[PDB]
Design a protein around this nucleic acid. Structure first.
Ligand SMILES: Nc1ccn([C@H]2C[C@H](O)[C@@H](COP(=O)(O)OP(=O)(O)OP(=O)(O)O)O2)c(=O)n1
Ligand SMILES: [Ca+2]
Ligand SMILES: [Ca+2]
Ligand SMILES: [Ca+2]
Length: 341
DNA sequence: GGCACTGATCAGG
DNA sequence: GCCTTGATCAGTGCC
């Protein structure tokens, strides 16, 4: 099997440069402002000119400005990026009907039936890069290997504006030498659990007793890692379907007052139904982010679709449930809908 | 024993 | 900050 993975470079910031080419060569930081005070919010992404100096996704805007006070700080325009992304995704469908759109800026193509070997695959990857550059003036990185996991590791290694193949021999090398923390799906908490077991490379998971592994990180991740170490991971490229759609808004001030919270909750419902478009959910969850930033949620599933009127009345009941069962003040409040008809 | 369902967790974009 | 193109866990009700 041959998998080609495409990952768009510094995507949000790059779209902003395409739309305003005077930004080219300047550090650009795309921000999500929460509106609680001035410059409250977090960085969504930054282009490489900013990232070079430590301005990275997730950090506080105030922290970014301490590092690069003269960078260009732009508000996130996700609707614009989403529309640009959709156009590029339509470009990719021309190269394979087996395509898995994995997020707003990534896709997997199964090109098993389009090329014979890694040489032809590399050439097709070049063709894809040039096409997206030609039509949308966006640069991407391409990773190619025998499965989705190594195709992604390949792209990680070639970023930015690159292309890389991980052939069968290199796959065997990585199983021995790749830092296990760098395997997709292994986050800090799991990486720490593993280190405490002495596992530092995929190969190590083959010699440890399975129940030990499973007891620490769970059955699913244990099997996942072992399948990879044995060079036996194969998951097909699958069409992804949206399963939940929601909106969460930050309140001006932390509160436990129902009447205070309601106007924000109802705004989240309005925006959520807008995003639902033609989908009709049978389930609704109210989702509260506490002051200490924990997340608490309560839901309700109906044997029928939920009208916006039913969303309003049920959401208040669920929020009350949350207030009844947790005593912390709420900082953000929202809803998420799912189980579409 | 194991399926179906919930809310919490961990992950990653 | 915000979103799920999320999956999996423990706890449970149930057959
Ligand atoms: N914590 C994060 C990470 C990413 N994103 C958004 C903005 C990114 O542009 C996009 C893609 O994520 P990458 O993780 O693919 O980021 P870039 O595409 O920004 O960087 P790179 O060139 O390393 O791929 O998703 C976000 O909102 N919040
Ligand atoms: Ca990217
Ligand atoms: Ca990405
Ligand atoms: Ca990691």
């Amino acid at each position: 099997m041959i998998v080609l993975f495409v990952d768009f470079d510094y995507f949000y910031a790059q779209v902003e440069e395409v739309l305003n080419p005077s930004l080219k060569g300047k550090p650009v930081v795309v921000c999500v402002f929460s509106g609680r005070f001035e410059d409250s919010g977090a960085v969504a992404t930054a282009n490489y000119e900013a990232r070079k100096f430590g301005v990275k996704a997730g950090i506080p805007i105030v922290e970014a400005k301490k590092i690069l006070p003269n960078a260009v700080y732009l508000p996130m325009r996700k609707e614009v990026y989403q529309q640009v992304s959709s156009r590029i995704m339509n470009l990719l469908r021309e190269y394979s009907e087996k395509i898995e759109i994995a997020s707003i800026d990534e896709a997997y193509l199964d090109i098993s039936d389009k090329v014979r070997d890694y040489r032809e695959a590399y050439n097709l990857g070049l063709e894809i890069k040039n096409k997206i550059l030609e039509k949308e003036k966006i640069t991407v990185t391409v990773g190619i290997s025998k499965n989705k996991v190594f195709a992604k590791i390949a792209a990680d290694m070639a970023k930015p504006n690159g292309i890389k193949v991980i052939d069968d021999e290199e796959v065997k090398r990585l199983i021995r030498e790749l830092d296990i923390a760098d395997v997709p799906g292994i986050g800090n908490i799991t990486a720490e659990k593993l280190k405490k077991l002495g596992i530092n490379k995929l190969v190590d998971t083959l010699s440890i007793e399975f129940d030990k592994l499973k007891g620490m990180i769970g059955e699913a991740k244990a099997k996942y890692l072992i399948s990879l170490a044995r060079d036996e991971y194969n998951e097909p490229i699958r069409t992804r379907v949206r399963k939940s759609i929601g909106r969460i808004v930050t309140m001006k001030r932390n509160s436990r007052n129902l009447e205070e919270i309601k106007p924000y909750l109802f705004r989240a419902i309005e925006e959520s139904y807008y995003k639902l478009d033609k989908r009709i959910p049978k389930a609704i969850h109210v989702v509260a982010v506490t002051e200490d930033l924990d997340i608490v949620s309560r839901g309700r599933t109906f044997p029928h679709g939920i009208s916006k009127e039913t969303a309003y009345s049920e959401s208040v009941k669920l929020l009350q449930k949350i207030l009844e069962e947790d005593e912390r003040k709420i900082r953000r409040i929202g809803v998420r809908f799912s189980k579409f008809i």
